[PDB]
């Protein structure tokens, strides 16, 4: 259903080539053939508006195969040849001027602008739109093409012949948005400075580096979401306001008008955390943003995250001791189900709170039901809003601790039902609500730097080297559990009762896989002979082979992802501080920074960073002399050559 | 300057950064004299006027970065490398900035197995680094991959 | 042994012939003044064959004696037209030697005397083997192109060479240029041979002509693992279409890469061979995309549907083994006293029950499944692996052996239920753990479970067929040591060791610690036991079992680069296998037909890629 | 003790345990011996070669 797309694009590219050879002028245009174009164009029946497989005329083929000598012949003979965009569901809009631009150099682009060209031509088709699709996204307009091909001579040549530097796209992207999401970042910086130079202070109401796209997102916030570390350092140099330089000690003054968490406008820290593309987390190690999060965490972020780590921990103990002291009543009838299959000797009270001890629990039980609703009023309005399970593909897949705490407050309000309607199976929802309840104490272990990168590693084993193990465990313990069952099916299950029921035979074979029971042995009755063989094979490929290989998987992984977890932990401090800043009122959380009213700098908030910069006379000697006009080493050097032939031979 | 690759421009832009001590893209005659005094030698305030008006093609007295970049083509270092090495650096350099990092060499060693500790990775850079920043240039990387 | 002995007693014997001969020693060195004296005799007996059949001219050729070799040719009978008439150096003429000596004026001096450019150098030290260090070839121009002699290949063609020259293996000259170890200099000599090849008598010219097993030069570059030669041959088959700034377009001819319907292709030949450099053509530019087109489209959706039929098969085999018919014991349990607990036996023939008729469907399904496995696997081993030539398929892929053994054990327990034999649990205990552990075969269409099933078969045959030889050394010594201590003792208190079969299964479980251990604490144990079980617990639980964690841990990070290309070579082996078995109505041809779009009769696959615009500034 | 496998495990065949036990012990068979006891082998195995240059020169300062 979707792989016909890859075929149908490749159907057109061959059909384009076939129309070239079965045409006199197109084959003449694919090569130079300057003798042949003068031969053909003096005729009458020659369709110079010949539509190929996409809409191509002779000038497009002269341009795409860059025949400038064949281009001069066609412009003399056909007047409406700078016009006529292509038609097919692929390349649309694209005239001969675009193709002369994209090839990084032509004399045709000086020639076509002389022949009244068309620079508003929106090249909008299915081959100029960014997606996991077409390998390039250059833009729509001819200036957007000339920008992102590194053409410094052509962009100066376009604006002189009446261009448009501001015009957006179908996506809403301007010219300067396209320069940011190119894969050649340092040549994009030189084109960034050039395209602002020809703005010439337009009166166009926030001139061109503040204008948002259809998402609503400035060029400064597009270096941040996409992952442009090169552009983000370049765009920051307009923000800083450097105060003084006392020798080797500077004092810059950054502008937190778009970085810091503002009001209802979605700030830049709220857009990185809610985004994929792992290079976006590289922005959180940058000189205004690293110092902002650390000053929002040491001061107001950590002491509030411990006062929520202690209210919740006194909430679970209030919920635990209402399960320990739950009501039980002795067994009524008299052991009616037969012997050796019944040992329960209590049961659960219908409704009995009539003693002074139960009213103490009635205080405690009402706390954990009120607290259960509060959990479902601060997070369920995100699943009330952003979808139930079909439109809600974001927070289930993103945060693991979202699921465990909605499940906790669901199991309490199952027990609220069963206590009131007087059901029987209450030992089951309190079995979930305790293990789910105490394992959200693992959530409040991310502010402590000791325990922080350890809970990162546990969720990378569960969704990693343990479900790579649990499939080839369930293969083995469905084979052998059906093998141990059929052997002990013809035996006596009263001196060895590990296998007398196929739900039970799954349970003992799973424990012998983990060696968390001993093993079937009697030493008074001569066992079946096949058991001594099939348990001996099961002892090798469980205890000696597959479990010690699982130590080798978790031991190989843990030194490979060992600096990623310190990148993942410091990105969960940002995810915590942003969340704590939102849900808490402004009366407890002061806005970070220093205001500009009383210091006379405006309405924008500032942040001062001072840094003892550097030395290295040797570096600055090399550049100022241009200006000046008229052993562990043996261990390290061994590691270079192991990289050296490791690189040049690949 | 018609041949400059992404590497030398990413080196010259950082070289423009520490030389400029007011954050914008304009080199004044005064802030050129700030660096010159830190070299021990003294200016004469006409030598500062000499070096600015040598190449100030627009005519503003403030050296912009395109006029800084074509200036380092006049005082060029050299162009002599191999096409496989320049491709090999762009594989190593993740965030396209013309520099390899301490976390960008622990990635390359991890793909080759090699079981490196954090201490030897900082000891690799001390034999790679020339100017003394703890950050390998492109010229520092070419000097190691064929010479020593 | 015998070949290396036969060489060294013969390589020294022809040296012994030199020291005892007048002019052969005068050919060993220059010796020009004595060489004039000897030739003016009555008769020199000029042949006088040594240990390998060489003349005095071959000695002058082999020791680079240009001065003597000029002198002998005027006083020569047919020595120039003369092969070495013996064993291992056989057929090697004096033209052959001067070529391999890489720089001679004698090669002009010999071919001046109309010397034989056609001479079959078929001894035994010219055939390709591990016994022979060089496969230079069989002909002089086969020699000259391999030793990188530019001038002599220009000169052999001039004097009427033999540019095709198929051989004992059927190898063309261009075949022998791929079998060389110096891959770079082969690329220069490759194009130099096709320039003198051009056309005229078609015969599918020399980059198409196969050898005596059927193999083009392009397909031989794949099988042997030649990678630098492989990309050079690809340049002839690609076809650039249009370039649009960075975005180019290539139109690779997919002829010798894709199996048409038969007639073994390149992808079928990388899998069958086993070289490490062979599985590297699977990462070149047409082959990398071709596999990922046949696996994304017609691969995984036909390998997950096939995996779900097998798992629905293994449940209907398991559920007819859970509900198998049994009856209570009618044999009077006083049969050996207090030492048996068999209380239920196996029915003879009793299916008259509506519960049994539903089960009777389940056994007849899993028996028909046991014929069909032996009809798609055993006819393949009839032609390749009759009884013990299956040894390659033994060691190479173990899932051939397990899936045959599964369908075999079902037929063994099919016979035992028809004739009502006694022990059915002995076939079924093999028939279950073989039948469920074949679901591990279908863990290769997943990047999740892919390189984990390869690590299991590396640990078993590399690091647990190593540890289990020094385990059985230990647990047979202590098992006979624990037995003779508790031999003179009550077997109803601490009965782990009461007979020697069970003492080998107590100690086997004490080595892996899957039992607690002998400890009664109510009776005084023998004094010798507490010593020798303390020394047992140290070299089992603490020394060797934690050593195997350090060995599986060391191997897993060391060949983790290897398992990521062992997995992608199991994608191709699955892609090819389903391509052969399934019909042509399903699985359409990969690529795009080139008949409709006016180009030819071939099959084409195109690729479109961006080339990173800074590379264009390096293309200045 | 079940977290460290220094007893066996609650198993008392010839009487039937409640149904919820075998589910919640199976999850405590995994966050357990399987996950958080082999992670501690890997974590002590990671650190034992990271600080191996230090633990020697921290020993030579225990002679002084
Ligand atoms: C209102 C109701 C409760 C009233 C008071 C509760 C007291 C907690 C709040 C006040 C103190 C908060 C604080 O600021 O102190 C937090 C201390 C550790 O702070 P530190 O000084 O060591 O940080 C120094 C870090 N360095 C070494 C890098 C420099 O920890 C603590 O007491 C945290 C207290 C318990 C938090 C439970 C978290 C759940 C545990 C999970 C384990 C898995
Ligand atoms: C806003 C945050 C939440 C605030 C919640 C406040 C709500 C108040 C209630 C909280 C818990 C409700 C559950 C309590 C219900 C039962 C209490 C009870 O009935 O009395 C407590 C028990 C005695 O019960 P009994 O009837 O079995 O005695 C037999 C006496 N006869 C013989 C007369 C029959 O006393 C004992 O034994 C227990 C021994 C003492 C241990 C309990 C203290 C908790 C342990 C550690 C806390 C550390 C926290 C910081 C880290
Ligand atoms: C992380 C991945 C885990 C995958 C799941 C693995 C475990 C699947 C668990 C299934 C059942 C658990 C639910 C418990 C309730 C049903 C129990 C059950 O299972 O019913 C029991 C039946 C019959 O036993 P009985 O002794 O009570 O009757 C004796 C009758 N008299 C006395 C005449 C001989 O036995 C049978 O179902 C025999 C049929 C085999 C049942 C399981 C095989 C199907 C699923 C396999 C997983 C797919 C693997 C993919 C890789
Ligand atoms: C490609 C073609 C291959 C398939 C061929 C289909 C053949 C059709 C059937 C063949 C027979 C197979 C089974 C033969 C065994 C006898 C069946 C039987 O006798 O009845 C099945 C039992 C009923 O109970 P009962 O026999 O104990 O007594 C009766 C109840 N009473 C206590 C009231 C008396 O049912 C149970 O045990 C519960 C069953 C639990 C297992 C369910 C299946 C496992 C799930 C698989 C899903 C994953 C697939 C991957 C996608
Ligand atoms: C009559 C018998 C018919 C039997 C039908 C059973 C299903 C086979 C149908 C063909 C689909 C194969 C497939 O497409 O299956 C690739 C998997 C799952 O497909 P999907 O979820 O990615 O897309 C959803 C695609 N739709 C929407 C069509 C489901 O792709 C992946 O997970 C690969 C990524 C690795 C993680 C998977 C690990 C799971 C291991 C064992 C599972 C048992
Ligand atoms: C562990 C790897 C091999 C697997 C088993 C090794 C052989 C063990 C013997 C039998 C086990 C296999 C067959 C099982 C059933 C056969 C019965 C049998 O055979 O009866 C065991 C015999 C006699 O025992 P009993 O107490 O029942 O007689 C009564 C003596 N009364 C009255 C003094 C107590 O004992 C004996 O075979 C004495 C044999 C002594 C040493 C055998 C070692 C095998 C040789 C090389 C091993 C490879 C090492 C390479 C490194
Ligand atoms: C009845 C009395 C005792 C008051 C009970 C209130 C608190 C005990 C509860 C109710 C609201 C709870 C909070 C509701 C929301 C959250 C956010 C939640 O965040 C996540 O799960 C984010 C996970 C991710 O981002 O991946 C973690 C628990 C927490 C702090 C909860 C901590 C415990 C709180 C403060
Ligand atoms: C999904 C997570 C929890 C890990 C998956 C691993 C499976 C391979 C394990 C864990 C969950 C286990 C199952 C959980 C529940 C049960 C029911 C339970 O059967 C009984 O009712 C036993 C009777 C009794 O306890 O008295 C024990 C076996 C079985 C199938 C277990 C068999 C082994 C399973 C499938
Ligand atoms: C490379 C090789 C040597 C692997 C090493 C494995 C051996 C140390 C193990 C694996 C299989 C074990 C055998 C599995 C089955 C049996 C049958 C078992 O049963 C009996 O013969 C007693 C009969 C009864 O129990 O009534 C006695 C031990 C024995 C030989 C075991 C002895 C120890 C063996 C040979
Ligand atoms: C009786 C009815 C239900 C038929 C059920 C079909 C299955 C019992 C059989 C039919 C064809 C069999 C397949 C035929 C051939 C192969 C290739 C075989 O390949 C190997 O031997 C592994 C090594 C390799 O080829 O790479 C693995 C099993 C498999 C998929 C078989 C799995 C079991 C299948 C699906
Ligand atoms: C690697 C080793 C050196 C470190 C620690 C070893 C000890 C813990 C072991 C080695 C020898 C053992 C002793 C060897 C002999 C005996 C006799 C043993 O049984 C008897 O007393 C036999 C007679 C009787 O039961 O009355 C009781 C324990 C004891 C002291 C053992 C206790 C444990 C010992 C001291
Ligand atoms: C004796 C009976 C009862 C059980 C014995 C089990 C033995 C014979 C079987 C069952 C499990 C099997 C293994 C399961 C998994 C793998 C990994 C695979 O990549 C190659 C085959 C290999 C290595 C199998 C080899 C044979 C094996 C060890
Ligand atoms: C079935 C009932 C009785 C108990 C089962 C408990 C299971 C489902 C729960 C309880 C404890 C939970 C784990 C506790 C801790 C973590 C670490 C966190 O970073 C990711 C989630 C993860 C990995 C949880 C996954 C789900 C989990 C395993
Ligand atoms: Ca144990
Ligand atoms: Ca135990
Ligand atoms: Ca300045
Ligand atoms: Ca300037
Ligand atoms: Ca970098
Ligand atoms: Ca440097």
Swiss-Prot record, chain A:
Post-translational modification: Glycosylated. Phosphorylation at Tyr-137 by SRC leads to an increased calcium influx through the channel. Probably dephosphorylated at this site by PTPN1. Phosphorylation by PRKCA at the calmodulin binding site delays channel inactivation.
Modification type Phosphothreonine: residues: 647
Pfam families linked to this entry: Ank (PF00023), Ank_2 (PF12796), Ion_trans (PF00520)
Catalysed reactions, as listed in the record: Ca(2+)(in) = Ca(2+)(out)
Subcellular location, record wording: Cell membrane
Alphabetical list of Gene3D superfamilies matching this protein: Ankyrin repeat-containing domain
UniProt protein name: Transient receptor potential cation channel subfamily V member 6
Source species: Homo sapiens
Gene responsible for this protein: TRPV6
Swiss-Prot record, chain B:
Record PTM text: Ubiquitination results in a strongly decreased activity.
Modified residues (Phosphotyrosine): 99, 138
MF (Gene Ontology): adenylate cyclase activator activity; calcium channel inhibitor activity; calcium channel regulator activity; calcium ion binding; calcium-dependent protein binding; protein kinase binding; protein phosphatase activator activity; protein serine/threonine kinase activator activity
Residues binding Ca(2+) 2: 56, 58, 60, 62, 67
Domain of life: Eukaryota
Transmembrane segments: none
Matching SUPFAM superfamilies: EF-hand
Subunit (UniProt): Homotetramer. Interacts with MYO1C, MYO5A and RRAD. Interacts with MYO10. Interacts with CEP97, CCP110, TTN/titin and SRY. Interacts with USP6; the interaction is calcium dependent. Interacts with CDK5RAP2. Interacts with SCN5A. Interacts with RYR1. Interacts with FCHO1. Interacts with MIP in a 1:2 stoichiometry; the interaction with the cytoplasmic domains from two MIP subunits promotes MIP water channel closure. Interacts with ORAI1; this may play a role in the regulation of ORAI1-mediated calcium transport. Interacts with IQCF1. Interacts with SYT7.
Family stated for the protein in its record: Belongs to the calmodulin family.
Protein name listed in UniProt: Calmodulin-1
From Swiss-Prot, chain D:
Protein name as annotated: Transient receptor potential cation channel subfamily V member 6
Positions contributing to Ca(2+) binding: 8
Tissues where this protein is expressed: Expressed at high levels in the gastrointestinal tract, including esophagus, stomach, duodenum, jejunum, ileum and colon, and in pancreas, placenta, prostate and salivary gland. Expressed at moderate levels in liver, kidney and testis. Expressed in trophoblasts of placenta villus trees (at protein level). Expressed in locally advanced prostate cancer, metastatic and androgen-insensitive prostatic lesions but not detected in healthy prostate tissue and benign prostatic hyperplasia.
Gene transcribed to yield this protein: TRPV6
Phenotype for residue 32 to T: Decreases channel opening, and thereby strongly decreases channel activity
Superkingdom of origin: Eukaryota
Disease linkage: Hyperparathyroidism, transient neonatal: An autosomal recessive disease characterized by impaired transplacental maternal-fetal transport of calcium, high serum PTH levels and signs of metabolic bone disease in the neonatal period. Skeletal anomalies include generalized osteopenia, narrow chest, short ribs with multiple healing fractures, and bowing or fractures of long bones. Affected individuals experience postnatal respiratory and feeding difficulties. The condition improves within a short time after birth once calcium is provided orally.
Topological domain ranges for the Extracellular compartment: 12-22
The family this protein is said to belong to: Belongs to the transient receptor (TC 1.A.4) family. TrpV subfamily. TRPV6 sub-subfamily.
Parts of the chain that traverse the membrane: 23-43
Renumbered ranges of motif Selectivity filter: 7-11
Annotated consequence of substituting residue 8 to A: Abolishes channel activity
Subunit structure: Homotetramer. Probably also forms heterotetramers with TRPV5. Interacts with TRPV5. Interacts with S100A10 and probably with the ANAX2-S100A10 heterotetramer. The interaction with S100A10 is required for the trafficking to the plasma membrane. Interacts with BSPRY. Interacts with TCAF1 and TCAF2 isoform 2. Interacts with calmodulin.
């Amino acid at each position: 259903r979707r792989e016909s797309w890859a075929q149908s694009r490749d159907e057109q590219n061959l059909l384009q080539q076939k129309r070239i050879w079965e045409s006199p002028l197109l084959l003449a245009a694919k090569d130079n053939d300057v003798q042949a174009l003068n031969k053909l164009l003096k005729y009458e029946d020659c369709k110079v508006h010949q539509r190929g497989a996409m809409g191509e005329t002779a000038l497009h083929i002269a341009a795409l195969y860059d025949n400038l000598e064949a281009a001069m012949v066609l412009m003399e003979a056909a007047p409406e040849l700078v016009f006529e965009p292509m038609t097919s569901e692929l390349y649309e809009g694209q005239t001969a001027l675009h193709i002369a631009v994209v090839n990084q150099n032509m004399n045709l682009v000086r020639a076509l602008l002389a022949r009244r060209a068309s620079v508003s031509a929106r090249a909008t088709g299915t081959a100029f739109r960014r997606s996991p699709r077409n390998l390039i996204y250059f833009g729509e307009h001819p200036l957007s093409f000339a920008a992102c091909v590194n053409s410094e001579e052509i962009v100066r040549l376009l604006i002189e012949h009446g261009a448009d530097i501001r015009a957006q796209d179908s996506l809403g992207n301007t010219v300067l948005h396209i320069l940011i999401l190119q894969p050649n970042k340092t040549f994009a910086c030189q084109m960034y400075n050039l395209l602002l130079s020809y703005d010439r202070h337009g009166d166009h109401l926030q001139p061109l580096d503040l204008v948002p796209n259809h998402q609503g997102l400035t060029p400064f916030k597009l270096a941040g979401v996409e992952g442009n570390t090169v552009m983000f350092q370049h765009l920051m140099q307009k923000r800083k306001h450097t105060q003084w330089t006392y020798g080797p000690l500077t004092s810059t003054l950054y502008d937190l008008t778009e970085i810091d968490s503002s009001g209802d406008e979605q700030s830049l820290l709220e857009l990185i955390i809610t985004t994929k593309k792992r290079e976006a987390r590289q922005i959180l190690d940058q000189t205004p943003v690293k110092e902002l999060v650390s000053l929002k965490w040491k001061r107001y972020g950590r002491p509030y995250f411990c006062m929520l780590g202690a209210i919740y921990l006194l909430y679970i103990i209030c919920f635990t001791m209402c399960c320990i002291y739950r009501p039980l009543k002795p067994r009524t009838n008299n052991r009616t189900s037969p012997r050796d299959n019944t040992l329960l000797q209590q049961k659960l009270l219908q409704e009995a709170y009539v003693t002074p001890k139960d009213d103490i629990r009635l205080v405690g039980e009402l706390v954990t039901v009120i607290g259960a609703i509060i959990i479902l009023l601060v997070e369920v309005p995100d699943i009330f809003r952003m979808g139930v399970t079909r439109f809600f593909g974001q927070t289930i897949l993103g945060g693991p601790f979202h699921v465990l705490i909605i499940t906790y407050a669901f199991m309490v309000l199952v027990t609220m039902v069963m206590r009131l309607i007087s059901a029987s199976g209450e030992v089951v929802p309190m079995s979930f609500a305790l293990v789910l309840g105490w394992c959200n104490v693992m959530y409040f272990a991310r502010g402590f730097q000791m325990l922080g990168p350890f809970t990162i590693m546990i969720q990378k084993m569960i969704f990693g080297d343990l479900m790579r193990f649990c499939w080839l465990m369930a293969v083995v313990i469905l084979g052998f559990a059906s093998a141990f069952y059929i052997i002990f099916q013809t035996e006596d299950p009263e001196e060895l009762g590990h296998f007398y029921d196929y739900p039970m035979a799954l349970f003992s074979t799973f424990e012998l896989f983990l060696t968390i029971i001993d093993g079937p042995a009697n030493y008074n009755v001569d066992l079946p002979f096949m058991y001594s063989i099939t348990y001996a094979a099961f002892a090798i490929i469980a205890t000696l082979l597959m479990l010690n290989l699982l130590i080798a998987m978790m031991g190989d992984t843990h030194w490979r992802v060992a600096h990623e977890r310190d990148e993942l932990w410091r990105a969960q401090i940002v995810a915590t501080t942003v969340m704590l800043e939102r849900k808490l009122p402004r009366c407890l959380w002061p806005r970070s920074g220093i205001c500009g009213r009383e210091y006379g700098l405006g309405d924008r908030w500032f942040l001062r960073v001072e840094d003892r910069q550097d030395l290295n006379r040797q570096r600055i000697q090399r550049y100022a002399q241009a200006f000046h006009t008229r052993r562990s080493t043996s261990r390290s050097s061994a590691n270079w050559e192991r990289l050296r032939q490791g690189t040049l031979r690949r | 300057a018609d041949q400059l690759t992404e590497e030398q421009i990413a080196e010259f832009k950082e070289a423009f950064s520490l030389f400029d001590k007011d954050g914008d893209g304009t080199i004044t005659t005064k802030e050129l004299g700030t660096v010159m005094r830190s070299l021990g030698q003294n200016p004469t305030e006409a030598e500062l006027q000499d070096m600015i008006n040598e190449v100030d093609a627009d005519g503003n007295g403030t050296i912009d970065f395109p006029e800084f970049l074509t200036m380092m083509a006049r005082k060029m270092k050299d162009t002599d490398s191999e096409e496989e090495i320049r491709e090999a650096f762009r594989v190593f350099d993740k965030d396209g900035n013309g520099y390899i990092s301490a976390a960008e060499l622990r990635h390359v060693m991890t793909n080759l197995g090699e079981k490196l500790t954090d201490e030897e990775v900082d000891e690799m850079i001390r034999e790679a680094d020339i100017d003394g920043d703890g950050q390998v240039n492109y010229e520092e990387f070419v000097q190691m991959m064929t010479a020593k």
